[PDB]
């Protein structure tokens, strides 16, 4: 599934991201935007081997198992496969663990880069919640 901006928007506030630890609504769906473009069933593989899933793009590195990376923790004890539903349940309770971690938001690349910093406002402006 594709969402559109404001339907992932609501589904993420639903799943209690908006000011999860501290991170407006708006930054999330920066991430989502930049990760995988809304699509849940998207997947990218990264230079170290593992491989990113889903509308979050969550790293096989360390918390889900997909099979076939290297020594590769299971964090959020999930098949990787599950973070491709069109149910956002599972990538949501992945995410808490990973943004409770230590470095908050920053463990996505792409937040950093390209969220950081910037108005995440806009991301959620003209959305029904
Ligand atoms: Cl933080």
Not at 48 to 57: A, F, M, N, P, V
Request: hydrophobic letters at 35%; one cysteine or more; aromatic letters at 10%.
């Amino acid at each position: 599934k594709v969402f559109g901006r404001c339907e992932l928007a609501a589904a993420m506030k639903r799943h209690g991201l908006d000011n999860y630890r501290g991170y407006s609504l708006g930054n999330w769906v920066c991430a989502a935007k930049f990760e995988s473009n809304f699509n849940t069933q998207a997947t990218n593989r990264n230079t170290d081997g593992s491989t990113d899933y889903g509308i979050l793009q969550i790293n096989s590195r360390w918390w889900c198992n997909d099979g076939r990376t290297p020594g590769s923790r299971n964090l959020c004890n999930i098949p990787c496969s599950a973070l491709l539903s069109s149910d956002i349940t599972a990538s949501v309770n992945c995410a808490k663990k990973i943004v409770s971690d230590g470095n908050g938001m920053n463990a996505w690349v792409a937040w950093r880069n390209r969220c950081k910093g910037t108005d995440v406002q806009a991301w959620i402006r003209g959305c029904r919640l």
